[PDB]
Paper text:
Recent research suggests that [name] may catalyze the conversion of fructose-6-phosphate to fructose. To explore the specific interaction between [name] and [name], we supplemented ~20 mM [name] during purification for cryo-EM determination. Purified [name] presented the activity to hydrolyze [name]. The cryo-EM map clearly shows the presence of [name], confirming that it occupies the same binding pocket as G6P does. The conformation of G6PC1F6P and interactions with [name] closely resemble those observed in G6PC1G6P. However, D38 and L73 stabilize [name] via hydrogen bonds and hydrophobic contacts, partially compensating for the smaller furan ring of [name] than the pyran ring of G6P. Despite this, the change in the position of the epoxide oxygen atom disrupts the hydrogen bond with E110, diminishing the affinity between [name] and fructose. Additionally, the smaller furan ring of [name] increases its distance from the coordinating residues, further weakening the binding.
Author numbering: 1 to 141, 147 to 351
The structure:
Amino acid sequence: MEEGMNVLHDFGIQSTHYLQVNYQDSQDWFILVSVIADLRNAFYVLFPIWFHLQEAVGIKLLWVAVIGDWLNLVFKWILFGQRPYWWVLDTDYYSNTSVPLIKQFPVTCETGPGSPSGHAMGTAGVYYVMVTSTLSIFQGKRFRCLNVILWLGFWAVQLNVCLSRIYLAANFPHQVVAGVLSGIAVAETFSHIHSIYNASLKKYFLITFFLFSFAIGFYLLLKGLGVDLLWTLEKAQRWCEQPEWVHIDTTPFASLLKNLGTLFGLGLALNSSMYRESCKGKLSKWLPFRLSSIVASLVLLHVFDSLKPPSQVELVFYVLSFCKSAVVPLASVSVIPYCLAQVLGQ
Ligand SMILES: O=P(O)(O)OC[C@H]1O[C@](O)(CO)[C@@H](O)[C@@H]1O
């Protein structure tokens, strides 16, 4: 368990050093890839687009994203993985040998273990869902050429995300592969479970409560036993060079709370009374209606993302993050379409 992991870590460090030294004129592109792969874009830019066209795709997209993120946190907690930016400066493995230089970027101070890659998991799951849904829509309309093109695009996206994660020295190469495989598995599993559409608010509430209870109880039980699951928060602050790069939005509680909040918000929004009256005033099948809904949702959500909850106190930050992430599904399905109905169509 010792040598088998030390060899793998050394291989990862060597690969990161190679990528950083011999491909120096690509760093901005890799940063851009690592920025547009965050799940915030899957909850703010992709759900509004896919919900107004084949709503089932949007519902499946949100369910896959949320459950994949929760499984990612659980596996991160139970697997006890390292990261290749506090390892070279800490390990004793390089005694009697030169220390390979590694360059750190402002997007390379992550608080939390990285046994499965976080960006790769979500990207693989969401984009697999998107590609499969797009293929399923167009089957009725040289379809094999379309299959080839979309699968090539999806695999190119996955490979670019993997190289971006490795290049920044944020994760090891043996973690992005696991993330991609697990994301594909989760996407397939929720592809083959058609039992989440006709769901009442009670099921959504109970599911969110069960997930929250399991996470908190597991963490508290491990702490009571003696195991600390928040060891990485100490390491991230020390081995980060500039101390202003470590944030609080990339800690393994804000992500969980935001995922639970957006799940609860979607559940409340679907069962609301305003969603029932979508097909009133003006029929929802109109192409201009769908385009206007998409445009208004995107613009208002992008402007509303400018609000940042205060982080002086952690409990206030947590509650405000929950209440803020619970609104983004509630405003694109039940409020904006109602306003469009009441404004135009008469
Ligand atoms: O890909 P990494 O190294 O896990 O980065 C963390 C990512 O995973 C997450 O923890 C999501 O679970 C986010 O904080 C972030 O998007």
